[PDB]
Amino acid sequence: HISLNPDLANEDEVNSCDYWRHCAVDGFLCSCCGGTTTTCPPGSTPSPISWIGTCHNPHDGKDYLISYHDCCGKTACGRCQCNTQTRERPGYEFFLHNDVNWCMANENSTFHCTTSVLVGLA
Amino acid sequence: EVNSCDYWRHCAVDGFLCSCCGGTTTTCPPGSTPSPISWIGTCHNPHDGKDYLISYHDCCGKTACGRCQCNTQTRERPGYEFFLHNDVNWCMANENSTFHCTTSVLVGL
Amino acid sequence: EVLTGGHSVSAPQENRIYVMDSVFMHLTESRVHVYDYTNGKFLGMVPTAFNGHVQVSNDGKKIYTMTTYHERITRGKRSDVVEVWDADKLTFEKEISLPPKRVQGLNYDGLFRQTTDGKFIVLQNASPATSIGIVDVAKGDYVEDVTAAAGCWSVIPQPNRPRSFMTICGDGGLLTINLGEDGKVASQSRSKQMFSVKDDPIFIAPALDKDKAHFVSYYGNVYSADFSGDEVKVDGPWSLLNDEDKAKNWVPGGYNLVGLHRASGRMYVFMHPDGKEGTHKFPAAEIWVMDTKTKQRVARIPGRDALSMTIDQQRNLMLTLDGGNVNVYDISQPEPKLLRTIEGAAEASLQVQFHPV
Amino acid sequence: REVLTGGHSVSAPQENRIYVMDSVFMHLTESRVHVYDYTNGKFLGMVPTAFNGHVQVSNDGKKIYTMTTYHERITRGKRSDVVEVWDADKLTFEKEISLPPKRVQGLNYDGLFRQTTDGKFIVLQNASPATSIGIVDVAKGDYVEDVTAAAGCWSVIPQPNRPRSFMTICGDGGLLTINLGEDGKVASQSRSKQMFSVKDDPIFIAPALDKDKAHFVSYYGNVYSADFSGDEVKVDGPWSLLNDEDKAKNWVPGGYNLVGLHRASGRMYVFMHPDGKEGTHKFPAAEIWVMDTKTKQRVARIPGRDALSMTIDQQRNLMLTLDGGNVNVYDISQPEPKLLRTIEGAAEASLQVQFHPV
Ligand SMILES: NCc1ccc([N+](=O)[O-])cc1
Ligand SMILES: NCc1ccc([N+](=O)[O-])cc1
Numbered sequence: 002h003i004s005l006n007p008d009l010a011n012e013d014e015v016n017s018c019d020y021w022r023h024c025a026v027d028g029f030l031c032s033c034c035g036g037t038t039t040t041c042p043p044g045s046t047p048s049p050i051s052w053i054g055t056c057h058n059p060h061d062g063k064d065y066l067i068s069y070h071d072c073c074g075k076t077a078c079g080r081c082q083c084n085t086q087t088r089e090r091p092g093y094e095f096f097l098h099n100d101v102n103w104c105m106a107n108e109n110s111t112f113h114c115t116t117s118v119l120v121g122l123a
Numbered sequence: 124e125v126n127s128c129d130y131w132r133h134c135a136v137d138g139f140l141c142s143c144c145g146g147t148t149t150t151c152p153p154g155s156t157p158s159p160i161s162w163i164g165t166c167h168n169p170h171d172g173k174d175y176l177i178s179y180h181d182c183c184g185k186t187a188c189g190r191c192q193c194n195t196q197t198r199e200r201p202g203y204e205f206f207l208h209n210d211v212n213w214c215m216a217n218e219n220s221t222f223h224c225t226t227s228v229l230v231g232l
Numbered sequence: 233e234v235l236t237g238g239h240s241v242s243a244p245q246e247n248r249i250y251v252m253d254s255v256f257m258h259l260t261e262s263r264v265h266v267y268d269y270t271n272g273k274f275l276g277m278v279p280t281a282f283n284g285h286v287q288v289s290n291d292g293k294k295i296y297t298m299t300t301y302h303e304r305i306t307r308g309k310r311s312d313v314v315e316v317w318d319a320d321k322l323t324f325e326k327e328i329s330l331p332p333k334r335v336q337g338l339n340y341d342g343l344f345r346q347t348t349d350g351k352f353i354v355l356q357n358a359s360p361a362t363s364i365g366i367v368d369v370a371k372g373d374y375v376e377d378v379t380a381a382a383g384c385w386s387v388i389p390q391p392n393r394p395r396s397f398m399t400i401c402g403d404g405g406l407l408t409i410n411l412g413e414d415g416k417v418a419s420q421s422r423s424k425q426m427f428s429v430k431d432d433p434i435f436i437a438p439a440l441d442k443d444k445a446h447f448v449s450y451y452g453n454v455y456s457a458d459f460s461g462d463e464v465k466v467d468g469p470w471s472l473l474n475d476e477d478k479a480k481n482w483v484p485g486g487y488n489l490v491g492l493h494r495a496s497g498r499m500y501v502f503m504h505p506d507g508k509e510g511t512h513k514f515p516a517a518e519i520w521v522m523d524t525k526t527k528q529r530v531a532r533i534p535g536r537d538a539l540s541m542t543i544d545q546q547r548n549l550m551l552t553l554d555g556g557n558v559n560v561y562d563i564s565q566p567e568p569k570l571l572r573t574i575e576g577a578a579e580a581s582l583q584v585q586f587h588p589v
Numbered sequence: 590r591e592v593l594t595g596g597h598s599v600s601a602p603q604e605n606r607i608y609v610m611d612s613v614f615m616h617l618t619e620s621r622v623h624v625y626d627y628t629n630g631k632f633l634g635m636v637p638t639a640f641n642g643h644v645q646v647s648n649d650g651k652k653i654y655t656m657t658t659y660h661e662r663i664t665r666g667k668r669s670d671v672v673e674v675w676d677a678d679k680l681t682f683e684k685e686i687s688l689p690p691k692r693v694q695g696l697n698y699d700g701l702f703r704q705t706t707d708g709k710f711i712v713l714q715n716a717s718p719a720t721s722i723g724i725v726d727v728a729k730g731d732y733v734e735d736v737t738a739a740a741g742c743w744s745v746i747p748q749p750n751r752p753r754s755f756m757t758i759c760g761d762g763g764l765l766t767i768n769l770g771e772d773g774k775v776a777s778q779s780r781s782k783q784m785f786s787v788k789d790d791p792i793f794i795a796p797a798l799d800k801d802k803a804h805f806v807s808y809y810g811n812v813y814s815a816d817f818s819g820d821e822v823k824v825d826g827p828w829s830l831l832n833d834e835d836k837a838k839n840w841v842p843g844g845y846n847l848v849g850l851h852r853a854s855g856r857m858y859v860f861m862h863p864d865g866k867e868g869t870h871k872f873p874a875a876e877i878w879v880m881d882t883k884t885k886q887r888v889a890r891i892p893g894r895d896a897l898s899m900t901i902d903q904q905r906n907l908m909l910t911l912d913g914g915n916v917n918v919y920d921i922s923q924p925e926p927k928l929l930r931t932i933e934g935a936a937e938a939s940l941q942v943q944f945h946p947v
């Protein structure tokens with residue numbers, strides 16, 4: 002349960018690309034960009050759409066559905082760039098695919114950073 | 124050679140040498156536009172022992188070339204001696220002021 | 233001495249390659265770097281704003297780019313465009329307006345293509361609903377939106393037909409689209425299922441012959457689509473792997489990760505060991521060279537951490553690209569021979585292309 | 590289970606915040622301001638600034654001002670030079686103020702983008718390439734005045750003891766003082782006597798600025814001063830930064846935003862390097878020297894860590910230094926500065942850092 006709340010974890014843990022919920026992140030972790038795992042940095046806008054991953058939580062042994070909403074409308078954060086591809090699939094499985102910009106439907110599609118939002122159990 | 128930042132004519136270049144960007148010492152890369160204005164440097168030619176005025180006309184209207192970045196400041200002076208100054212964009216008066224690369228044109232003694 | 237412009241690219245067209253640099257760390261300043269593959273010389277560049285895509289016109293006279301602008305970059309009205317640039321002068325000529333849904337994503341070849349006859353540009357859209365856009369080059373107009381391609385992804389032109397192409401669909405099959413003289417869809421067909429989407433997903437990058445395409449899978453299998461005939465016939469899998477390969481868990485990996493030398497039927501693939509879930513975009517430990525007729529590997533050479541490649545048929549050449557550096561290989565014999573490496577051709581490129589000859 | 594939200598404010602208090610102006614010269618069309626917590630190195634946010642952005646924070650601490658250039662198609666199309674007003678706490682865009690298309694495009698010296706002491710006008714450098722100073726009225730949100738009198742001069746030095754007066758350095762080696770009216774137009778001006786020889790002892794444009802006077806260092810390690818306690822500026826100097834032992838190693842200043850004044854003590858901070866000669870005026874700091882400006886004597890010297898630019902906070906007795914990519918934080922409450930921490934990778938190519946006003 003504590004491993005389900007990134008706000009309680011040490012920041013170095015959650016800002017690492019190996020943090021369990023980042024398993025299909027391809028981008029800059031918002032938590033290193035003035036945001037948190039589930040909040041956009043100031044002045045960047047959440048994406049209403051995303052790709053989704055299923056990631057294993059090694060702490061509680063359960064598998065979870067994670068939604069990779071981006072924060073948009075600012076230029077590239079540049080920090081904590083991660084590239085993990087667990088269960089990621091090509092564009093013919095579009096909402097499993099992370100080589101596209103999930104800011105694509107935002108008022109401004111400039112890609113700033115990527116978040117890992119817990120939807121629930123897989 | 125001319126692609127070296129130590130090449131004698133490049134003595135007040137702060138930018139990318141156009142000769143590394145598909146141009147030459149005296150020609151802009153394809154689709155980049157010469158600046159009609161420039162800062163000027165005074166550089167010593169070791170081959171003949173003579174000093175020359177070099178005009179550092181930029182090539183403009185394309186994004187940064189990114190190759191052969193040189194920064195030499197021989198006889199360079201601040202903005203109150205404006206045409207000896209290289210911390211400003213000499214593409215500033217072009218139709219498109221985006222800075223691409225810098226040329227080193229021999230004017231004279 | 234007087235400084236002049238108006239100059240053309242110094243090297244002959246046959247020497248030219250196009251490295252599409254995403255500049256991902258500063259993605260609003262993507263660009264195409266043009267290089268001479270014979271000597272590694274930088275010949276010039278084309279700025280392509282946010283996440284540019286590029287191709288060269290089939291006739292070699294023009295460069296086409298696709299990009300997105302906003303009036304104030306991070307705010308203001310969006311403009312998705314195709315641009316036409318002169319290939320020799322590297323100068324802008326014409327903007328073609330797109331609906332604001334062109335694909336924003338990494339530079340797989342199949343997102344931005346053209347018909348064999350060169351008359352239409354064929355591009356991938358996502359709104360996130362997918363469709364394929366058709367652009368009439370001569371008219372400078374977007375003319376058809378292929379919404380029938382919804383749920384499919386990427387464009388594979390058919391080199392044996394003037395204005396036909398295929399796309400890979402979420403059913404594991406291929407949708408063929410045949411355009412009329414005006415660029416509207418004249419006819420379409422769906423193949424039978426080629427691969428299992430859940431059990432053996434393929435990479436989108438085709439190894440493209442004149443009348444057939446081969447695809448490799450996450451698990452090292454090979455599928456084919458033959459379009460010599462009237463309908464697309466599909467086949468596979470066959471495995472790239474022998475028993476020793478399997479025991480070391482060799483699988484393919486990369487982006488534009490395959491190529492075909494048409495004369496010989498040799499297929500080139502980036503491979504790495506210790507494959508498992510999540511390793512499909514790993515750099516090449518090796519390049520494997522497969523004979524597509526005998527279905528046997530005929531060479532394996534160091535991968536140089538390459539991610540993408542392209543082939544030139546006439547000169548018997550392969551380029552590989554690790555994100556920053558371009559390797560040039562002679563592929564006239566089964567074993568490729570490394571000719572040279574062009575260091576610092578880009579900061580973050582996943583696509584290189586030859587000028588057509 | 591969770592929902593992503595935006596609309597949030599900067600996590601750390603204003604008193605903790607610094608602004609690193611990243612030119613991103615290798616990709617200069619994507620310059621930006623990085624906002625950092627100087628107490629712990631935490632990245633707090635950023636403001637995009639397009640091609641060669643410049644930045645400052647409103648005197649009241651509520652707003653961030655940027656200056657930049659756009660074109661319709663970036664590398665082609667119509668040009669728009671602007672000042673933008675952004676909320677300091679939300680880091681959101683609020684307003685654009687149109688400028689004539691001649692705002693200075695150049696490296697981020699403080700004096701290119703400043704404000705009057707009263708905070709009512711933004712005062713910027715133009716070059717078309719003829720120089721003038723542009724005036725923006727903050728209340729109106731309009732450009733209101735081109736100070737063509739400043740032709741042949743460069744950079745803006747506000748006078749901290751007057752609401753809407755500033756000075757600029759001219760090609761005659763003196764200073765021109767401009768006194769604005771409440772409408773932002775020139776109400777009066779004056780020109781100092783010659784302060785320095787442009788040919789023989791050129792100064793760095795970066796002032797070491799006190800309430801009623803400004804000091805400047807020269808290429809050859811001399812110090813010049815401009816006193817504006819009165820209506821007319823009185824000038825003085827040179828005195829030399831160097832003692833006899835310093836002369837042997839040819840110590841000279843170098844850098845960009847290379848000096849600072851701690852006003853309560855009169856201590857001037859200056860980046861220095863040995864083996865000075867023609868062309869070394871922008872070399873990184875081998876040392877930081879600390880000069881008592883009253884006694885005209887060095888009181889401390891420390892290693893420079895290859896710094897190129899600095900800024901000072903009066904209230905907290907701090908100096909930041911910046912080497913282009915990293916920011917060092919020093920306690921300057923005593924004559925010898927003490928290094929507290931270094932923020933690594935704050936920028937790719939920054940020659941300017943500034944404190945949030947407190
Ligand atoms: N999911 C990361 C990402 C974001 C933007 C692009 N793009 O091409 O604009 C590609 C990939
Ligand atoms: N994070 C995905 C990715 C990987 C590699 C490159 N590259 O250029 O090598 C670009 C983007």
Ligand SMILES: NCc1ccc([N+](=O)[O-])cc1
Pocket residue numbers: 137138209210211212213222617641694695696
């Ligand atoms: N002469 C080099 C150069 C070019 C452009 C800028 N700028 O700020 O745009 C600064 C310096």
Ligand SMILES: NCc1ccc([N+](=O)[O-])cc1
Pocket residue numbers: 137138193194614897912913914937938939940
């Ligand atoms: N070419 C001059 C110059 C030198 C140092 C930086 N920097 O950011 O440290 C930028 C630009």
